[PDB]
Design a protein around this ligand. Structure first.
Ligand SMILES: c1ccc2c(CN3CCCCCC3)c[nH]c2c1
Ligand code: NI
Length: 341
């Protein structure tokens, strides 16, 4: 059964609700982004209207084989009418194609659903500036003050400088980056750019990247592993055993591996700064865990909500325990009392 926090009141709409069969009363299914916990249930046999971004629609058609007649892509930053209700899609600063959805209810209520997002001050100058928002369905992934991490720009500077130093010292070193979903493409693209290389990957991963409308992509990625010194592998293979095995396959072209695992937050953020990050090393293999987040930090989330001043907040993450729900509710009240709304 579909949970209450995936239903939009006063409409026939659900959000990220594809794993519950036919939802009673649902005339249109919205999909915020192409991550598996959100699309779970979609396939070539789905026959209801799906509303999403252009990029998300490309992935639905090519990766899940959803029939074109049921895919309804909408442009961003543009007022659209869906089943008699005005809606707007806004960039979520998450992965490629990810959106927030603004719903203008017939009765005058305005609802913002953030999907998954990384809050940024630039959102304060979008179409959100124009009107009041009554209810906020919020990505609360990191809603506690221990969740600190650096800017994406600082993390990429560290990665570029690290990779460039290592390969300039040893021209026979290979760089490897882990992936298991779309998102965080800047990590591998920025490293390849500084090294003058294309990024090598499987046919399946190449297909996925070709769906993302990234400018000049044909100049940056390849399926020819032998021509490339930046390789993408499944996140599960980024360990000493898996990387040793990969180095064997490269046929003595390389004699060292520098590997990156772009996690979200890990507890080592509480002690260390990005500049002081060090790898785990065994022989000629080194692995860096880098805190590249596509979700709001606690402080970023707090700033966004105190700017927006919603009348009611509905969390969409960490909803399953009473301890998590109580913790989040206490922070929402603090934020309201500090700001005066
Ligand atoms: C999500 C986040 C930010 C924005 C903006 C604000 N823009 C300011 C102008 C300079 C750079 C572009 C960004 C418009 N729509 C958005 C959706
Ligand atoms: Ni996501």
């Amino acid at each position: 059964t579909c949970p209450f926090y995936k239903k939009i009141p006063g409409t026939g709409f659900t959000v990220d609700a594809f794993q519950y069969g036919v939802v009673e009363g649902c005339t249109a299914y919205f999909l915020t982004h192409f991550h598996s916990d959100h699309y779970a249930g979609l396939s070539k046999h789905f026959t209801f209207p799906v509303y999403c971004s252009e990029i998300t629609g490309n992935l639905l058609k090519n990766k899940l084989h959803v029939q074109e007649q049921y895919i309804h892509p909408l442009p961003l930053d543009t007022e659209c009418i869906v089943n008699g209700v005005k809606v707007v899609l806004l960039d979520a600063n998450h992965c490629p194609g990810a959106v927030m959805i603004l719903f203008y209810l017939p009765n005058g209520t305005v609802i913002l659903h953030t999907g998954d997002f990384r809050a940024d001050p630039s959102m304060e100058r979008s179409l959100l500036a124009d009107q009041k928002v009554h209810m906020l369905y919020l990505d609360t992934t990191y809603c506690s003050p221990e969740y600190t991490f650096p800017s994406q720009q600082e993390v990429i500077r560290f990665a570029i400088n690290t990779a460039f130093e290592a390969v300039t010292l040893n021209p026979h070193a290979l760089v490897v980056c882990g992936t298991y979903s779309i998102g965080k493409e800047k990590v591998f693209l920025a490293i390849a750019d500084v090294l003058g290389s294309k990024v090598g990957m499987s046919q399946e991963k190449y297909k996925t990247l070709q769906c993302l409308n990234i400018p000049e992509i044909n100049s940056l990625i390849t399926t020819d592993m032998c021509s490339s010194l930046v390789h993408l592998l499944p996140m599960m293979q980024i360990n000493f055993k898996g990387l040793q095995s990969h180095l064997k396959k490269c046929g003595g072209k390389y004699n060292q591996i520098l590997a990156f695992r772009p996690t979200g937050w890990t507890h080592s953020n509480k002690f260390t700064r990005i500049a002081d990050v060090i790898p785990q090393t065994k022989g000629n293999i080194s692995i860096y865990g880098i805190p590249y987040s596509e979700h709001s930090s606690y402080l970023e989330m707090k700033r966004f909500v105190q700017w927006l001043k919603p009348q009611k907040i509905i969390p969409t993450v960490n909803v399953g325990t009473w301890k998590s729900r109580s913790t989040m509710e206490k922070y929402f009240r603090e934020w309201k009392l500090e700001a005066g709304y």
